[PDB]
Amino acid sequence: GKLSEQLKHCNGILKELLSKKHAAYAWPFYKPVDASALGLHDYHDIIKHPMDLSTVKRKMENRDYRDAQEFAADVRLMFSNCYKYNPPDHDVVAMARKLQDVFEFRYAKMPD
């Protein structure tokens, strides 16, 4: 079906974002930000809705996403959190930009 086919494309994108091909810049986004471990004691005051690729993967596996739009909103929320918390000249923001380019260009190839 339409939703199934579009969610197959989303699952393909998710696998690519987690693949060794993109590991050099994807690694900050693999797991939830551990604010306490990183000494970022303001992270949860600034970021109300944390998101990361392991959470997107669990939601995809649990059939939480009913359509491609819901999946894309979570992937974009993950990048937006990075752009909100970190100064724009920081290394992690450059890595976010690169992984979001991978995401946006392949998401744009969504089947109709």
Of 6 and 81, which CB lies nearer to ligand P4X in the complex structure? 81
Of 68 and 95, which CB lies nearer to ligand P4X in the complex structure? 95
Of 21 and 90, which CB lies nearer to ligand P4X in the complex structure? 90
**3-class secondary structure per residue, 8-69:** HHHHHHHHHHHCHHHHHHHHHHCCCCCHHHHCCCCHHHHCCCCCCHHHHHHHHHCCCCCCHH
Cα 85 to Cα 55: distance, rounded to the nearest angstrom: 19
Q: Which residue from 91, 101, 105, 110 is in contact with ligand P4X, where contact means CB under 6 A?
A: 91
DSSP string, 76-112: HHHHHHHHHHS-TTSHHHHHHHHHHHHHHHHHTT---
Q: How far is the CB of 107 from ligand P4X (least distance, A)?
A: 19
Total interface residues for ligand P4X by CB under 6 A: 10
Question: Footprint of ligand P4X on residues 60-89 (CB under 6 A)?
Answer: 82, 85-86
Q: Which residue from 28, 73, 80, 104 is in contact with ligand P4X, where contact means CB under 6 A?
A: 28
Q: Which residues bind ligand P4X (CB under 6 A)?
A: 28-29, 33, 38, 40, 82, 85-86, 91-92
